[PDB]
Amino acid sequence: VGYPIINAPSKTKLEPSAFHYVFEGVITEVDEYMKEAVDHYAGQLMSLDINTEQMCLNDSVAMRMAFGNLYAAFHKNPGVITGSAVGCDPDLFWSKIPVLMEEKLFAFDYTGYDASLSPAWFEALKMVLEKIGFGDRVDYIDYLNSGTSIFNSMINNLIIRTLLLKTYKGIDLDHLKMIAYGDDVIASYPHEVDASLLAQSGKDYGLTMTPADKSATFETVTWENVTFLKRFFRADEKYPFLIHPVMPMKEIHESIRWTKDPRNTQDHVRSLCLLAWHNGEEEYNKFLAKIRSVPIGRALLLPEYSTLYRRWLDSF
Ligand SMILES: [Ca+2]
Ligand SMILES: [Ca+2]
């Protein structure tokens, strides 16, 4: 599985596609709170019994030698134990997320995540690695102070715990159920957590937190308005217990207007149809109708809705 929009390359490596005009495009050291956050998180990772062993086979691939098994673990176990979605199949994993979350959801975005991360956060990251067995290859982290999504997601787990602890004294982290993919995060708790208050705490650690998904105000987050990896959560009409990961056409329309080479348009458009069909038939067909309003589009293999839908059902 590849993430077309989320892992979209930079515009530097892109050129206009044949569909360019067919669519439009308009806090210094580790403190008492982090320490406890480490404690709680490291504990959870232990329940996984990740293999402390090195790996059995672009130079910086020595780190794939050091943390190869760690990465493999998160990849094999995306969820609330890892607190990571890195490596999930949105088509299947979306039906599980709701079942793994506590009743009250809370989310928010970061501004300049990677840039705003103080050195302390990395020290904390090391401590987590010490407690789960990789403490001898801890120096490999200074190379940031393949696995960026992993480590950044782990730092996000430390942040949320820390902020919760500093905002509400004595809170029990055992009831925190979150999932991260880099700096994007979906989270929950049995009681309403106010993200606007977490943000105030984030300031103390040099973090800039803002309402999620471009919002002027921190509003209540719900399954009807929450997004994860830019996708919404929409239950199927025939099987409500099956959740469609719904990427907005708006995001798709923009992506189809570019490409790396005209020789990948076929693959790239395939990717986009795999995301696109979840919006519903009427939507998908209009989408293909447009693609086919230009010569190259009419020469592309585009999967018809029903086959995609039926295949999806059978995938469960
Ligand atoms: Ca065990
Ligand atoms: Ca986000």
CATH number at residue 210: 3.30.70.270
For the residues of 17-84, what is the DSSP string, one character each? -TTTTTS-----S--HHHHHHHHHHHHHHHTT-------------SHHHHSHHHHHHHHH--BTTTTB
My answer on whether 295 and 187 are in the same domain is no
Rounded to the nearest angstrom, the distance between the alpha carbon of 227 and the centre of ligand 2 is 7
**Close Cβ partners of 43 (under 8 Å, ≥ 6 residues apart):** none
Of all ligands present, the nearest one to the C-alpha of 231 is 2
My answer on whether 243 and 296 are in the same domain is yes
Rounded to the nearest angstrom, the distance between the alpha carbon of 138 and the centre of ligand 2 is 29
Going from the C-alpha of 12 to that of each of 9, 15, 133, 260, the distances in angstroms are 8, 8, 40, 9
My answer on whether 255 and 183 are in the same domain is no
Rounded to the nearest angstrom, the distance between the alpha carbon of 165 and the centre of ligand 1 is 26
My answer on whether 247 and 300 are in the same domain is yes
Q: How many CA atoms lie within 13 A of 218 on its CB side?
A: 16
CA proximity to 78, closest of 152, 180, 151, 5: 180
- Is the CA virtual torsion 245, 308, 313, 182 positive or negative? negative
The distance from CA 50 to its chain's CA centroid, rounded to whole angstroms, is 22
Rounded to the nearest angstrom, the distance between the alpha carbon of 96 and the centre of ligand 1 is 23
Please check if 109 is assigned to a binding site: yes
My answer on whether 205 and 248 are in the same domain is no
CA proximity to 252, closest of 224, 289, 277, 223: 277
Q: What's the CATH code of the domain at 297?
A: 1.20.960.20
Cβ atoms within 10 Å of 57's Cβ, excluding its own: 6
Of all ligands present, the nearest one to the C-alpha of 181 is 2
Q: What residues make up the domain containing 194?
A: 99-116+147-222
User: 């987590």: which residue's tokens?
Assistant: 128
My answer on whether 271 and 213 are in the same domain is no
Of all ligands present, the nearest one to the C-alpha of 229 is 2
Greatest CA separation found in the chain?
Answer: 64
What resolution in Å is listed for this PDB structure?
Answer: 2.4
Of all ligands present, the nearest one to the C-alpha of 195 is 2
Rounded to the nearest angstrom, the distance between the alpha carbon of 107 and the centre of ligand 2 is 7
CA proximity to 33, closest of 127, 169, 129, 126: 169
For the residues of 183-236, what is the DSSP string, one character each? TEEEEEESS---HHHHHHHHHHTT--EE-SSS-SS-----TTT--BTTBEEEE-
My answer on whether 301 and 187 are in the same domain is no
My answer on whether 156 and 181 are in the same domain is yes
User: 């696109």: which residue's tokens?
Assistant: 276
Rounded to the nearest angstrom, the distance between the alpha carbon of 281 and the centre of ligand 2 is 28
My answer on whether 267 and 176 are in the same domain is no
Give CA–CA dist 302/266, Å, rounded: 9
My answer on whether 104 and 214 are in the same domain is yes
Rounded to the nearest angstrom, the distance between the alpha carbon of 171 and the centre of ligand 1 is 25
My answer on whether 111 and 197 are in the same domain is yes
Give CA–CA dist 3/229, Å, rounded: 9
H-type alpha helices, 90-194: 90-93, 97-100, 113-116, 119-129, 148-167
Of all ligands present, the nearest one to the C-alpha of 228 is 2
Rounded to the nearest angstrom, the distance between the alpha carbon of 43 and the centre of ligand 1 is 10
Of all ligands present, the nearest one to the C-alpha of 221 is 2
Rounded to the nearest angstrom, the distance between the alpha carbon of 209 and the centre of ligand 2 is 10
My answer on whether 103 and 215 are in the same domain is yes
Rounded to the nearest angstrom, the distance between the alpha carbon of 106 and the centre of ligand 2 is 11
Asked whether the beta carbons of 229 and 3 are under 8 A apart, the reply is yes
Please check if 49 is assigned to a binding site: no
